[PDB]
Design a protein around this ligand. Sequence first.
Ligand SMILES: *Cc1ccc(-c2ccc(C)cn2)nc1
Ligand SMILES: [Ca+2]
Ligand code: NI
Length: 269
Amino acid sequence: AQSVPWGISRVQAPAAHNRGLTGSGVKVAVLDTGISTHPDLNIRGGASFVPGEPSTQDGNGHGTHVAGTIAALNNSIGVLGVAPSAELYAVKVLGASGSGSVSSIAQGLEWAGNNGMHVANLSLGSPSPSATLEQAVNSATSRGVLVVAASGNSGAGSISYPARYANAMAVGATDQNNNRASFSQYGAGLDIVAPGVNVQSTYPGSTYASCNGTSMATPHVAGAAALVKQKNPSWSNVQIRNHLKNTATSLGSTNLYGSGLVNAEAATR
Ligand SMILES: *Cc1ccc(-c2ccc(C)cn2)nc1
Ligand SMILES: [Ca+2]
Ligand code: NI
């Protein structure tokens, strides 16, 4: 039996699925700790930029969880992603510890731009800026990748890098009341928010697990971008980002929420 995590419903992905929008034909790279083989995921390819972990399998759990929020398969098992027919790519930039370097992350972004990714999900970040990282964000963006990144978990009124960069779409986390999660970073550069508390998704060991974080919010938006791209195949990264923001539901504060809560129904109307 399949269950629909509350955040998938909150962003109104099922309304888009009922219009025949699933993210089919859209290439989404998850730049994370890998993605483990799982019966509720279809992993099309990928690459590893972590020396010492040549495979794209996930030794941490975080990348597999993120992937499932984007693209858990619509079937009779497990959970259901925002964009369950997205073409999923495992781009390992973080090791099994959950840490990586700005170089590894930049190599993932240059892979995404060299391989025709439409969306790159970066559920990662740091409080410090990086020229290496920024360069790669801009390069990927010029190659048509929509870079979607987590605002961070410090609870501060400023957001992490690379989400703070103009060419990244920065995503904060909300709770079931549509309030900002206590940990969710906000402030300048914040674009949008999505569910990020008690988010159930795919997890290694062929199982499912619930996590909190702006890392969990980010893939809701990555998935919504894929729905928008399937409906509007001619649109650019910038067009999709702007439409997601224009169609988001206001949550009563630009500082705390950016454009507000992502809404896949309104964005695919
Ligand atoms: C051994 C083990 C199993 C599961 C987890 C876990 C699940 C969910 C999240 C958010 C984090 N960790 N950790 C360790
Ligand atoms: Ca499923
Ligand atoms: Ni854990």
